[PDB]
């Protein structure tokens, strides 16, 4: 049996996700349209920028994240943003297509769309693979949400200062996830391990993205196409 | 009778305008769509950003602008960009509507559209008035192009260094314009004066815009919506 405050953490985390996840993908009509040079860079730059603001809204509602000093909140967001975006994007990923179906027909990004945004297959191979791995875990909503919160509250990120306080939070998060799986997820004897390995894979994707982004942002004809928030979060300042 | 090199300057300037003015306004479908908060800020930010790249392409083809040191070319563009955009936008302005008709129906910006982009009527009044003034001058293509080149080559802008070299160019430009009007524009006895007064009005619009932009860019929820080139050109660096 799960605890009362353990249940409170799941309830507040699920709600945070519902407030920051638009199941209708309707704000996508407000981005710069897809094209198919780097034809898909503008639309996917706007996608990432949009998603960063959702990830900040989610983080602001994680219990206790708000109580960290503003520096630490920046250091965690600056380094985990891309990982939480890869994490939440599983919701729109489909094993049936091997693409991300975000509502309408023009907002379905398969693998060839994403190469036209300036990224090579040495990022997209590990990325698509990661998504079918995470999709095969058939995670409950409660687990998908907890995994994002635990990826955010990692002390071992560049620039964090209160390693101890952030570590408390993250451990409080994995107690809940271990209890939840063990008590509410039949056949999850190995699932929590499979999820921690997913965080490991995410770190590897972060590196690959950070390398390919560095190349994309040192040529101004491309960084031009990026948004100010994307430049800020992925900038090295 | 106009001179040979005078005619060469008009020919090369008209061509520069044709290479950097899309009479089909077709790249407007590639901007963030209009909405009607600051609903029109994204689309009009993308409009200005687009136009800045056209103004740079035009400048790069003004005879002798290319031969200025890279600093001076930046100082002229950073201060005159908005004036050349107000100047070229006369082409899409219509006395019949009092709006800017840029091809399709959603790219027709009347005065209420432009207030939803974070600007007050103390900029839009002098702006719309300016446009019907410039529109009533029925300028030849040759004159409209020369006026942009003369607004660009003004030495009295912040940060210019070779005041003498830039002043040579600008005077070479007004000799052509005075000769052209006097020789090819029937009933232009007063027209060149009316055009120099238009440059004066442009300086006043520049100030008003620079004041309202400063307010818009000190609040990050709005500067966020701007593009990197717009931040750079209108930034104070």
């Amino acid at each position: 049996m799960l605890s009362d405050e353990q249940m409170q953490i799941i309830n507040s985390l699920v709600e945070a996700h519902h407030k920051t996840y638009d199941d209708s993908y309707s704000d996508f009509v407000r981005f710069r349209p897809p094209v198919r040079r780097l034809s898909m860079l503008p639309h996917l730059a706007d996608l990432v920028s949009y998603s960063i603001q959702k990830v900040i809204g989610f983080a602001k509602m994680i219990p206790g994240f708000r109580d960290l000093t503003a520096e630490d909140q920046i250091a965690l967001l600056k380094s985990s943003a891309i990982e939480i975006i890869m994490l939440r994007s599983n919701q729109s990923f489909s094993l049936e297509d091997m693409s991300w179906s975000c509502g309408g027909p023009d907002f379905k990004y398969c693998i060839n769309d994403v190469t036209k945004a300036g990224h090579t297959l040495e990022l997209l191979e590990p990325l698509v693979k990661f998504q079918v791995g995470l999709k095969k875990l058939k995670l409950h909503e409660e687990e998908h949400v907890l995994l994002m919160a635990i990826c955010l509250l990692s002390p071992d990120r560049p620039g964090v200062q209160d390693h101890v306080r952030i570590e408390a939070l993250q451990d409080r998060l994995c107690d809940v996830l271990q209890a939840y799986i063990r008590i509410q997820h039949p056949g999850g004897r190995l699932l929590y391990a499979k999820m921690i390995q997913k965080l490991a894979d995410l770190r590897s994707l972060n590196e690959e993205h950070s390398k390919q982004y560095r190349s994309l942002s040192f040529q101004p004809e491309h960084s031009m196409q990026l948004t100010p928030l994307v430049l800020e979060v992925f900038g090295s300042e | 009778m106009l001179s040979d090199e005078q005619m060469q300057i008009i020919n090369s300037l008209v061509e520069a305008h044709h290479k950097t003015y899309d009479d089909s306004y077709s790249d407007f479908v590639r901007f963030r769509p209009p909405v009607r908060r600051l609903s029109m800020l994204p689309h009009l930010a993308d409009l200005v950003s687009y136009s800045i790249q056209k103004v740079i392409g035009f400048a790069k083809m003004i005879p002798g602008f290319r031969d200025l040191t890279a600093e001076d070319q930046i100082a002229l563009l950073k201060s005159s960009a908005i004036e050349i955009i107000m100047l070229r936008s006369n082409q899409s302005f219509s006395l019949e509507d009092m709006s800017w008709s840029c091809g399709g129906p959603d790219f027709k910006y009347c005065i209420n559209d432009v207030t939803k982009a974070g600007h007050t009527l103390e900029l839009l009044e002098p702006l719309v008035k300016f446009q019907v003034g410039l529109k009533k001058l029925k300028l030849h293509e040759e004159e409209h192009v020369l006026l942009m080149a003369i607004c660009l080559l003004s030495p009295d802008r912040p940060g210019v260094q070779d005041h003498v070299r830039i002043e040579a160019l600008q005077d070479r430009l007004c000799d052509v314009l005075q000769a052209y009007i006097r020789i090819q524009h029937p009933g232009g006895r007063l027209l060149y004066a009316k055009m120099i007064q238009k440059l004066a009005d442009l300086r006043s619009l520049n100030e008003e815009h620079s004041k309202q932009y400063r307010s818009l860019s000190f609040q990050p929820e709005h500067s966020m919506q701007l593009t990197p080139l717009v931040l750079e050109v209108f930034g104070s660096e």
Binding site: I56, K60, I74, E232, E237 | Q219, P220, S223, M224
Partner: peptide
Amino acid sequence: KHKILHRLLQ
């Protein structure tokens, strides 16, 4: 340093 993030984080 980080103008936008500071805003978004209230």
